[PDB]
Amino acid sequence: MNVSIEEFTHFDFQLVPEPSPLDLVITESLKNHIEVNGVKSGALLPLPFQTGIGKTYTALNFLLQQMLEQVRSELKEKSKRLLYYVTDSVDNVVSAKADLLKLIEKQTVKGEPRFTLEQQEYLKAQIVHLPNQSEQLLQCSDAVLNDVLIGFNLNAERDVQAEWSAISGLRRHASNPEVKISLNRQAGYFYRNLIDRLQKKQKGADRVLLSGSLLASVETLLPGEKIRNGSAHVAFLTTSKFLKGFHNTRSRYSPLRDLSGAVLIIDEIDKQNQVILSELCKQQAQDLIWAIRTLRANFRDHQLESSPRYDKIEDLFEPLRERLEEFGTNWNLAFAFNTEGANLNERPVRLFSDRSFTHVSSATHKLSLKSDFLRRKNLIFSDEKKHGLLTRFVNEADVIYQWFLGTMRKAVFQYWENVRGLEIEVRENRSLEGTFQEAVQSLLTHFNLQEFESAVYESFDKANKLSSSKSYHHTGLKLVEVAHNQGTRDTVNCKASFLNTSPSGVLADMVDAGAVILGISATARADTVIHNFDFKYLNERLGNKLLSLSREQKQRVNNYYHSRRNYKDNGVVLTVKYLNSRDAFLDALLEEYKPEARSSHFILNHYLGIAESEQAFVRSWLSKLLASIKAFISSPDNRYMLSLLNRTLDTTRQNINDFIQFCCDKWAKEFNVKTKTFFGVNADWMRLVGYDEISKHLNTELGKVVVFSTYASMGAGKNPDYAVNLALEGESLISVADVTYSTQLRSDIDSIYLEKPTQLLLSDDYSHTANQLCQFHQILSLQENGELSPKSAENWCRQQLMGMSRERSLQQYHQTSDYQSAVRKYIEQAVGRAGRTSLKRKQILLFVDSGLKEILAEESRDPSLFSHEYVALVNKAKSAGKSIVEDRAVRRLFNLAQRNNKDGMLSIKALVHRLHNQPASKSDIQEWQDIRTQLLRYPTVAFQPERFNRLYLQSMTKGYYRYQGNLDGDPNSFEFFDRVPYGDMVSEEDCSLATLVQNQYVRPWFERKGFACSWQKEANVMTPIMFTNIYKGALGEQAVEAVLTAFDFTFEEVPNSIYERFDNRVIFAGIEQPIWLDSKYWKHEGNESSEGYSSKIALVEEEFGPSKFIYVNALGDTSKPIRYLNSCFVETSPQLAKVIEIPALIDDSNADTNRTAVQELIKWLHHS
Amino acid sequence: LYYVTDSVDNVVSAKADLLKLIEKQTVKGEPRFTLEQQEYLKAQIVHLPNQSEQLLQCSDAVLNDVLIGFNLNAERDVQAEWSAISGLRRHASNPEVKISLNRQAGYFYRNLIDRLQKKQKGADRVLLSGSLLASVETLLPGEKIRNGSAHVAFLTTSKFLKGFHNTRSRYSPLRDLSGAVLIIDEIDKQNQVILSELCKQQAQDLIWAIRTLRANFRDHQLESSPRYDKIEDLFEPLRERLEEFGTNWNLAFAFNTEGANLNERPVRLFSDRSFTHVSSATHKLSLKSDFLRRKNLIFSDEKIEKHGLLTRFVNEADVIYQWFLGTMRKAVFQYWENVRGLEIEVRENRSLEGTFQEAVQSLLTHFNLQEFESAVYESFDTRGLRQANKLSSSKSYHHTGLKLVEVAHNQGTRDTVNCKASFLNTSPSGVLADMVDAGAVILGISATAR
Amino acid sequence: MGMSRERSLQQYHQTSDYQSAVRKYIEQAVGRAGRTSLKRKQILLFVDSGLKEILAEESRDPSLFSHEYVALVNKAKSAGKSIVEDRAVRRL
DNA sequence: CCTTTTTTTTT
DNA sequence: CTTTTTTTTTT
């Protein structure tokens, strides 16, 4: 019996629950954004909320509030706005849903109930909890499934009834973990087939009109149908289910394509960076050779129907059609590829690529690619002693493959616009999701490309040019393996695995789609990119859509947390101790345990199972662990110790367990304690009935409980508390809340040991390729931030490709400043998990490793959002031995200065080479103009530009800086700023633009085109490689023409076969022999050797026979006479000189035009 | 030697009676064999059941030896699935449990063997011997057959038409029948059994297959190495026919049916391939290439137009598709005589069965036709015993066959059609004759055998 | 076009193929109950009336016919001799 | 207008 | 140099 909206017609929407300082924060930052950035824009508001004072409560109270708000609009009236609540763990998701259903019931406004019972039925019917397919099946009764099987005529198939018999046969014999593990695998497979047949029988021809018990049975089995049907607001799913989508009665709905208006309420947002990365590293690897050959063959003549339903789609594939033909002709795709040249066949070749400056390869010799014509086979070979290189082919082939996939997405979007207007039978599914199924099918069928069906479906969820906003976070690494195919012995396949975007890029894509994502986590703005999103990229990409909190709002939160946690005025003590290696302390204990052995080392190898390899480490985490144990036993009032180690002390290493068990029992007797220890408490242990047992012991018994867990084993949802009895605990407890929210007599831990967090480098275990992408993402995300200079990041990526031990990987991570903010994120969570109960002890102890004393002393954020128990852990470290600085932001600048230079050196070298082929592409020339147009119009930009971010270089000095490095050599050896105080200055004085603009001819020309006359005094100065090679080279080019403009000389476009080889085509004087140009800025750049120059003449002598040349150098010394040089470019007589070299046109002393030189030049071109 | 029957309860009974015959043999009043020869003869017999029951017979010790001895105890899914199989066997009989146990046993066996086959046919040859040999041989009865420890087999007719596994790949007894000796109990009942296997072939889209063949064959070429000598010539007539066929019917466009009485019911075109041609459409359907719309339109014309009939197109398309598959079979045989001795060492397994999987791989990769691997593999399970319609050779239905074609709109897209052609390229009587013509000596023991 | 399972069997009945098919079931459904040697002296056999005409057409060589199938064919053959279709003449 | 039970293997 | 659990949803 579904419930209508008639009860909300009498609802008093004016009446509202009383807001909270935590509640006001969420709405305050959102209302202003809506009235500034528009209504349908989106936002990425993070909220740094402490875990104890109201994360859920406020999170779910916001989710409920949006549920109530939409109902009023629907009642006052269209599709409901979705309100996903994405988390990481199923336990947390179900707990959040249960609390929400709890909240709808017992929430009382001003002391009286708010929701009538009927309203609760309506609101509860809007919430959904879509689980995985396996658990979805083992939730509905046998009657519910039988109605679906009978009502859809699926009982007449042998396979369907055979499977369902087994599922019903097994689920009846439940209650045994051995059976439980196979009912879940079996349930998932049957669920796919049952829904697949349900969708096949429903999407075509016959369509069952769902109603009555068939609707309830089909909605119970398909909760995603409740959303598609049209009565469901909220979904309660994990991140993995959000990234994989959920079935409705028609197809598989993906929320990533329907984000416009979504209100994602992602909880513990920082953890989703690793979760989203696990979905991205789990994509299928595609053969590049097969895909490119298949695309080339099915495109040369495979027309698409000329109907109004496919207009403008034939044009999106035209540039791809020509490129595929050109690509096939260049690399001879009619043949198959195969390696050659032994010392290349023993092991495969892996070719990492950033699609940018980082281009590490695992073949120590550069591999060429020759196209043999006698033996009809493309051969990959090595040449130990160029256009035809293996890396150039694979990069070119990858660009085309993603060009097709990119074009495929535009065609699908174009198709939807063609059919949205056509109102024939499109039904309610007129969105890009309803037509995605069809638009991909129709286009892949006409082109015969049905093999790419999966690769297009699974990938449907700012290019790599210097004239764009380049970044790794909308780009990706590309791991390619070139190994022999299976079975056949003389062919290879390019098994390419892509990472086309990043979890931070994915998060930005959600907000740009229109999502209103809310980040609810304490460490939601950490200064690491390994365990979080890059919030410096998300700041530049989103801009003002990345909402923040003002001074008063973060000050208001601290006051709220200071009230609900009033530690000092009520009276408590936070004792903090730092524990070192205490070899003497542990020696006495080990001797006293088993003194009969020769020495303590025998105890290590007899009763502890430790050799002379780990003895230095095991002692370190045993001496520090035990020393904290006895200090807890010294205090009788405290009776709860949680040790958060990194190694799971359980039945595995039980030899250690009994030694520490004996030490706890030994100290118990001499301190008058009946203590208890709870060993082996890992994720398995709390599951069955585990962590409730520890609560019961402190509920009734008298003693001290010591718990040995790990950081991983205390992820989230775990509530380390217990029920307190005043008979058990006397005046030890004391309330800290200024007011009194519900009681229920609960306490929490009062003394926790915090060992150093280790193994902070992310990992994946899905496959070897699956974590290969994960490890390469981490290296390239540290380099993009600026933690690693490109010298070391490329070194790390080269080792990562060849093969490294996990110890080597972590030793590189430890060397960066990202690792400090990573470990200070683990602690900030571990300390924050113990403050979930207001009613607290007075003597709260804190013991942490001394390997963290220096790390903790580096914390430098604002306590205005910190917890009460973490500032105490950091204040002791501040009031300690030494307090120094690490200069976080200045070592970042030295790396981003080095990085942007390396990008210019690598991209420009590729742009020039791609201009050395005939013809030059229209984009390539257009991009070349924009590089020079922006570079010399804006010599210094005020802010950080969002369109030419690799052109510039942030400097510690305004308007200039000093560098030192081989400008035409290795870009990894550059040094900047104070590293080289005697280097080459990149100021405006060095280029001497002031002398150039003093001229009466140059100055007027710049004003018309806006070219700079002076450099501003901002810190975003130009790159070194793109100031001498692109800027001074182009500054003279404009200066030369402007001087020669006022002498009846006009210049035209160089043709598309010698572009960039010559400045401009010169006309006038009436002479048929065309006049060319070679413009430079002085004689000290552009050597232009005679052999090199003679090469340029031949390529243009073939063009138009005889030719003339001029070697104008603009600025310089005007005193030196002109010279007359021959085609051999050595010396000759004047009248037999093919080329002429003018030393300068403007004086470098007082900026005087070379009137005599041009007059002879004017006279010379008349004679010639 | 094979003892092929059609029921599982009969082969095990025959094997059991054979084992008793060796033990209980009172020739001249004394045992025929000594106490040792019985073990040698018993080792030569092998019973090959389905994969599901082959798994549920080996003990957990045998599977542990294989999983540990192959480094498979690291795959994070092999151990996950093997945990469920181990955990489900320990329970009682419970027929509800057993029906689900046999389902998962077969799937796990398939997944385990292909991993055991990718890991063994590569470079890290595990050199199966010792107690690991008795473990795989127990899990793979069709491995002692490949190793020469046994020749006698005991399998059902379906297992004889599906093939069994060894450490390398799936061995099909049909393709290696020269010199065999089949013994078939109730031979008459195998006509129904073989026909049931021939009706399980997968339907192939004719429009996709012909368009795919035409696109790849136009330019993609084979290597000029000695291993592909005179193989390019086998495909030359097919290339010209593919180009001529594409030009005649305008294969650059897609096909679609337009007209009344053509969308409420799809057309079905049955054909004997010689003289029995029946169409489900009441009136003849023409096929016109629209150059303005860039579409090929199957339509019903209410008014004989030999040029441009739908039946003529499908018949020609079928002939070309079976021509490629027929040529594919000749190329595989041609490949195995250029590499039989001229390859010189390199690889043992010198047999049209061992070379067949590689020769299919190399040729389909050079032509970029890897989507036809399954279709080529299945066609050998039907016509492999081979390597007409010419009123100049033996014309009969028992080796010509029948073809059923379904022309309906494609899935998801409302303006294209596909010819899902289901074939019966031979008959069980033809299959039996091909088995005899391959060199097998067949014994048919049945009262109503004639 | 789609025919009822009845009409499939009706078309099969009109052929002489169906007559040699039913006489294959009987010849096996009777030889299976003959695997022993100890037998009663009154082995009875009762068969349907719809099989007397079919069983009277059996004319193959009796040099391998079972004892129980022979006795099943003579009784239907007792009604003199009946003209047959002469299967060859209608096959040509 | 004849009048069903039964089977194996891979997925 | 270096110090591990654990987590989801597909097929």
Ligand SMILES: Nc1ncnc2c1ncn2[C@@H]1O[C@H](COP(=O)(O)OP(=O)(O)O)[C@@H](O)[C@H]1O
């Ligand atoms: N006014 C209130 N503010 C915050 N929490 C409240 C309030 N009233 C009741 N609660 C309960 O206290 C709990 C505090 O949330 P909890 O999960 O302990 O911390 P957090 O949500 O910050 O992790 C909520 O679950 C909520 O049900």
